[PDB]
Amino acid sequence: NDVFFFRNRLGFLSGENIILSRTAKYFNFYPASIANLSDDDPIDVAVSTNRIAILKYAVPFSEELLIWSDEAQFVLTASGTLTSKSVELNLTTQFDVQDRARPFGIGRNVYFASPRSSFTSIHRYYAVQDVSSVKNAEDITSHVPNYIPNGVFSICGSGTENFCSVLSHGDPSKIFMYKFLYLNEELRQQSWSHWDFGENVQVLACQSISSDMYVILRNEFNTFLARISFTKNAIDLQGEPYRAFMDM
Amino acid sequence: LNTLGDNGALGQAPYIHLINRDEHEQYYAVFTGSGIRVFDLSGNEKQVRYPNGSNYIKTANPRNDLRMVTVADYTFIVNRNVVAQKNTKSVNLPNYNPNQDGLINVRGGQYGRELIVHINGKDVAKYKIPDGSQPEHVNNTDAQWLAEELAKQMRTNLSDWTVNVGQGFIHVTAPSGQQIDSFTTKDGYADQLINPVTHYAQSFSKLPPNAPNGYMVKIVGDASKSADQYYVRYDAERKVWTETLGWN
Amino acid sequence: PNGSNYIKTANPRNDLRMVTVADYTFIVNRNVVAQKNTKSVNLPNYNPNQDGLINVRGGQYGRELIVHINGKDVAKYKIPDGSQPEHVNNTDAQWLAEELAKQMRTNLSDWTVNVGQGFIHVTAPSGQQIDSFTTKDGYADQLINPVTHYAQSFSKLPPNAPNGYMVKIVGDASKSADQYYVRYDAERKVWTETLGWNTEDQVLWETMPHALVRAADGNFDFKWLEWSPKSCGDVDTNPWPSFVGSSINDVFFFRNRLGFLSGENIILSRTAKYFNFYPASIANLSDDDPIDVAVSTNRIAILKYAVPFSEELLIWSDEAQFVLTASGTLTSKSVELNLTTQFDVQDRARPFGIGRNVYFASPRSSFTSIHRYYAVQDVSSVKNAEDITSHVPNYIP
């Protein structure tokens, strides 16, 4: 299902099994010597839970690696250093994540899409402040329960512009945006506007680079790459009299 | 910035990933589901050759199947629909009978010892080392002469088997049709005078001192240190026993 | 002295980085890429095949000494019995060696054969090499023994040897180890340990960092700092350090070891010496060894800066912040390099920590936003960055 690099070792998530490589080499999966056990050896832990949870995604979060699965979230960790015996793979939380969309972590939080039957609900995975290791997921769409249509293919965002945008295959034209701001640790702003680019403009996955977001659109005559940059004071094109808020 | 071709150029549902490796190496990569079309952020197509095949990319629904993880050294594309498999075609020692090709290491002689080596239950070779006239016998107590003497008797008794002498070893190779069922040899002294050696050794220390260029022995456990039984292969050039990958 | 080109750069705010520690000040150009010198090699042209040795140790009556090189039984000397006084003189190893040598010299005119205390050294002419060195003792391997440049164990090492005989001690398949190279010294009669037989031992000093040092006079000198050679070990066992093919972004001292941040790799030195990057002994793992951890994350984050914060070292990167830590003490295996937070830091400016907090610049498109990195009070290890310019969003250019 997915490829991750835990520690110095390439890792794969296949079914309910996490397979890691020898530490030095990402390609070699087998022990260097069968005769002598080495800490630098492949690992074949299998997730341990009473339900069936195939491991779809691996997300780095906090100071841990969280191996998410459709119905559950797990932490890959070790008792001390990593051997083929030390690794534990515990089961932190049981929130449901739809897996067409990779979870995106803007800052401390990791944002993911949960699929209700008609409209998706985006959630935020955070480490709860008081307890030593309890992670919880707030639902950030509780105020807009039926806004984002069900197909969600991308969750993309910018720390610099403090925003998360979810592109949904359901309503192709819109890029649904959440703008947030944390003062102290409180959430001062929760906003869920949508940006609509055109009547028939199917929007492929935008991905911000710095403060500039590169969007790919359909027409449906010809597809294009365009740029959105949040520059306060700039004239987007040369010689233009004033920034003209005109699309394309 | 640019137009990236017709509506279907990128496909109905492309998986598009941004490879932000460097300031100058910012590229977008789209998976049409029929191929890979990479675009510079200025909109310029960058040719993707597909040496070594292109079928992995081909998928009906590439938003959902191809997953791309980008690490600084390499970018990995994983199709989730595809299932990993082993090649039955490439095998080590593909057809291998441990039974054939056994070796006997003659190391010494002493007066009055009957050298009896029996293969397949018939005492094939019977050479009694003799005493009573010392100068001829000191010449006779030597291992090398004993080996050649044993070999010639063995060749007559085993016409099909090919017997080849060595520095200390006597290598008995069965014809393909036949195999060595019993390799027991009676030294007439402790196991020291001569020793039957099979492809299994209780310990690395109990390994034949000299051997053919490829003799493989499986070092079974000494039942002292916990270990996984391992396979060791001799190299004549370097005179080192090393370690290997198994026999079938 | 020793060159000035390292400093020369078009944009020095961005390329030269200077880290000042009390003993030395290190200047790192990030544009420059570290490289190895093909020029300096150990045993630059080396065939293991040539120069094999046979150690004659004893004789016994009735044994045929047959030594065959290249498939012809070159030397055939039958030790004899039947008249004891002459034979006791004959059972001796040294005479046998010289006897074997002379036969060998006639049979191998081009090969040069030189006797030794117990060894017989066969050296092939440059054109030819020793394909087969097998010798038949006529007794156990004890009477005489062919010795190649590979030994299954240190114990299985020729007792006497030429002044430079190098043997690679392959594993005994008992203790896990890295096969190591051992070189004999005739003066001291000790086998010791060495650096390989065709391996480049040195990095090019120019490309690697340089230092500014106050002199006697008090006027500074800009010179390269010598980096230790790969004293022991072959290329496979002793891999070239990660920076050897790439640029070093920054220099840090974690624990007692100098460290470099190159690309997505953190390379540390042996604990005692800041310059030496390779293990002291390939044969024995030591906790005091270099470390080559690579940051583990699903995105591309080249590691630009290392900032000491709290009781941890935070290795910052442009899009992410990582903590360098170890499970217990530091070995090459213990270090973890986790991924605390994913805030964006522009890297022309080194983060500065006034007190508990570390302040950094994040680049929005038009105006920078300075942020403060603090350890959140309530949780055990959660670090967060407040934006201190939220009230003045567009002030700092």
> In 10 A of CB A57, how many CB atoms?
22
Rounded to the nearest angstrom, the minimum Cα separation between A84 and chain C is 13
Measured torsion, CA atoms of residues C213, C215, C220, C223, in degrees rounded to the nearest 10 = -50
Under DSSP, the state recorded for A20 is: E
Cα gap C319→C339, rounded to integer Å: 11
Tell whether A32 lies on the interface with B, counting CB pairs under 8 A.
no
Element (H, E) at B150: helix B143-157
User: Do residues B141 and B231 lie in contact, with contact meaning Cβ atoms separated by under 8 Å?
Assistant: no
Tell me the three state secondary structure of residue B134. Answer: helix
Q: CB under 8 Å, gap of 24 or more: what pairs does C387-391 form? A: C387/C362, C388/C359, C390/A181, C390/A183
Cis check for the bond before C193: say yes or no (omega within 30 of 0).
no
Distance of CA C59 to CAs A158, A160, C64, C80, C393, Å? 83, 84, 10, 10, 94
User: Do residues C161 and C80 lie in contact, with contact meaning Cβ atoms separated by under 8 Å?
Assistant: no
Cα gap A22→B50, rounded to integer Å: 29
**Angle at the Cα of C102 (from C96 to C107), degrees rounded to 5?**
125
Q: Which of A38, A184, A185 sits opposite C176 (nearest CB)?
A: A38
Cα gap C200→C185, rounded to integer Å: 22
- Residue whose C-alpha is closest to residue A107's, from C273, C319, C154: C319
Cα gap A56→A9, rounded to integer Å: 18
> In 10 A of CB C103, how many CB atoms?
17
A212: tokens are: 């500039």
Cα gap C348→A140, rounded to integer Å: 35
Cα gap C225→C204, rounded to integer Å: 11
Under DSSP, the state recorded for C240 is: P
> In 10 A of CB A14, how many CB atoms?
15
Cα gap C90→B222, rounded to integer Å: 43
Amino acid at A58: A
Q: Which chains touch A (3 or more CB pairs under 8 A)?
A: B, C
> In 10 A of CB C260, how many CB atoms?
27
Under DSSP, the state recorded for C244 is: G
Cα gap C394→C364, rounded to integer Å: 9
Q: Do A159 and C381 touch (CB under 8 A)?
A: no
Q: Which of A36, A160, A181 sits opposite C344 (nearest CB)?
A: A160
Cα gap C161→C110, rounded to integer Å: 22
Tell whether A219 lies on the interface with B, counting CB pairs under 8 A.
yes
Tell me the three state secondary structure of residue C195. Answer: coil
Q: Tokens 């456990």 appear where?
A: B221
- Residue whose C-alpha is closest to residue C5's, from C173, C207, C172, C142: C207
- Residue whose C-alpha is closest to residue C285's, from C336, C230, C243, C237: C237
CB-based burial label for B32 (10 Å; 0-12, 13-18, 19+): buried
C20: tokens are: 């000042």
Cα gap C132→C124, rounded to integer Å: 12
Cα gap B34→B154, rounded to integer Å: 67
Cα gap A79→A210, rounded to integer Å: 38
Cα gap C134→C122, rounded to integer Å: 13
- Chain B residues within an 8 Å CB radius of C147: 239
B10: tokens are: 């990128």
Tell me the three state secondary structure of residue C125. Answer: coil
- Chain C residues within an 8 Å CB radius of A34: none
- Residue whose C-alpha is closest to residue B109's, from B128, B132, B135, B134: B128
**For residue A172, what is the nearest residue in chain B, using CA coordinates?**
B13
Cα gap B203→B218, rounded to integer Å: 9
B162: tokens are: 């090919």
Output Rg (C-alpha) for chain A, integer angstroms.
Answer: 21
- Residue whose C-alpha is closest to residue C151's, from C113, C184, C181: C181
User: Do residues A174 and A194 lie in contact, with contact meaning Cβ atoms separated by under 8 Å?
Assistant: yes
Element (H, E) at C221: strand C221-224
Distance of CA A244 to CAs A239, A240, C175, C365, Å? 12, 8, 73, 18
Cα gap C53→C56, rounded to integer Å: 10
> In 10 A of CB C275, how many CB atoms?
12
B129: tokens are: 């080392």
Strand C257-262 versus strand C265-268 pairing type: antiparallel
B110: tokens are: 């002493």
**For residue A9, what is the nearest residue in chain C, using CA coordinates?**
C296
B84: tokens are: 């990993």
> In 10 A of CB A178, how many CB atoms?
24
Rounded to the nearest angstrom, the minimum Cα separation between A221 and chain C is 32
Cα gap A227→A211, rounded to integer Å: 10
What resolution in angstroms does the PDB record give? 3.4
Distance, C-alpha A137 to centroid of its chain: 14
C281: tokens are: 């002994």
**φ and ψ of A171, to 5 deg:** -100, 100
Tell me the three state secondary structure of residue B138. Answer: helix
- Residue whose C-alpha is closest to residue C111's, from C72, C65, C165, C55: C72
The distance in angstroms from the start CA to the end CA of chain C is 40
User: Do residues A65 and A4 lie in contact, with contact meaning Cβ atoms separated by under 8 Å?
Assistant: yes
CB-based burial label for C268 (10 Å; 0-12, 13-18, 19+): buried
User: Do residues A122 and A177 lie in contact, with contact meaning Cβ atoms separated by under 8 Å?
Assistant: no
Measured torsion, CA atoms of residues C253, C254, C255, C256, in degrees rounded to the nearest 10 = -40
Cis check for the bond before A220: say yes or no (omega within 30 of 0).
yes
Breaks (C-N over 2.5 A) in chain A follow: none
Q: Do A7 and C336 touch (CB under 8 A)?
A: yes
CB-based burial label for A50 (10 Å; 0-12, 13-18, 19+): exposed
Rounded to the nearest angstrom, the minimum Cα separation between A150 and chain C is 26
The length of chain B is 248
Q: Do A220 and B4 touch (CB under 8 A)?
A: no
- Chain B residues within an 8 Å CB radius of C302: 72
Distance of CA C25 to CAs A169, B95, B200, C264, Å? 56, 64, 61, 24
Distance, C-alpha C119 to centroid of its chain: 32
User: Do residues C62 and C80 lie in contact, with contact meaning Cβ atoms separated by under 8 Å?
Assistant: yes
Amino acid at C232: C
**DSSP 3-state helix, strand, coil percentages of chain B (rounded to 5)?**
10, 30, 60
Q: Which of C296, C378, C390 sits opposite A5 (nearest CB)?
A: C296
Measured torsion, CA atoms of residues C389, C390, C392, C397, in degrees rounded to the nearest 10 = 50
The distance in angstroms from the start CA to the end CA of chain A is 38
Q: Which of A5, A62, A130 sits opposite C297 (nearest CB)?
A: A5
Distance of CA B99 to CAs B119, B208, C29, Å? 12, 17, 64
The CB-side HSE value for B166 (13 A sphere, CA atoms) comes to: 21
Cα gap C319→C54, rounded to integer Å: 62
Amino acid at A147: Y
C230: tokens are: 């790969």
Q: Listing from the earlier edge strand, what are the strands of the sheet with C135-136?
A: C72-78, C64-69, C135-136
**For residue B61, what is the nearest residue in chain A, using CA coordinates?**
A100
C201: tokens are: 């031992």
Cα gap A164→A158, rounded to integer Å: 6
A26: tokens are: 């990402």
Tell me the three state secondary structure of residue C352. Answer: strand
Q: Which residues sit opposite C54 in a β-bridge?
A: C120, C146
Q: Which of residues 163-202 of C touch B (CB under 8 A)?
A: 170-174
Cα gap C392→C263, rounded to integer Å: 34
User: Do residues A214 and C347 lie in contact, with contact meaning Cβ atoms separated by under 8 Å?
Assistant: no
B218: tokens are: 């499986």
DSSP C272-302: S-SS--S-S-SSS--SSS-B--B---SS---
Amino acid at A235: I
User: Do residues C166 and C151 lie in contact, with contact meaning Cβ atoms separated by under 8 Å?
Assistant: no
A92: tokens are: 């932190």
**φ and ψ of C281, to 5 deg:** -130, 125
User: Do residues B57 and B30 lie in contact, with contact meaning Cβ atoms separated by under 8 Å?
Assistant: no
**φ and ψ of A143, to 5 deg:** -70, -20
Q: According to the entry, how was the structure determined?
A: cryo-EM
For an interface test with B, the pick among A206, A225, A248 (most B C-beta atoms closer than 10 Å) comes out as A225
Under DSSP, the state recorded for C25 is: E
CB-based burial label for C79 (10 Å; 0-12, 13-18, 19+): buried
Distance, C-alpha C50 to centroid of its chain: 26
- Residue whose C-alpha is closest to residue B206's, from B124, B105, B136, B114: B105
Under DSSP, the state recorded for C61 is: T
Tell me the three state secondary structure of residue C160. Answer: coil
Cα gap A201→A248, rounded to integer Å: 12
- Residue whose C-alpha is closest to residue C277's, from C355, C208, C380: C208
- Chain A residues within an 8 Å CB radius of B6: 221-223
- Residue whose C-alpha is closest to residue A164's, from A133, A118, A122: A122
Q: Listing from the earlier edge strand, what are the strands of the sheet with B169-173?
A: B162-165, B169-173, B102-106, B194-197
Distance of CA C83 to CAs C21, C59, C86, C88, C89, Å? 81, 15, 6, 9, 11
Distance, C-alpha C156 to centroid of its chain: 25
Element (H, E) at C95: helix C93-107
B236: tokens are: 């004549």
DSSP B200-243: EES-SSSS-SS--TT-EEEE---SSS----EEEE-BTTTTB---
- Residue whose C-alpha is closest to residue C242's, from C288, C206, C208: C208
Element (H, E) at C85: helix C84-90
A84: tokens are: 């083929």
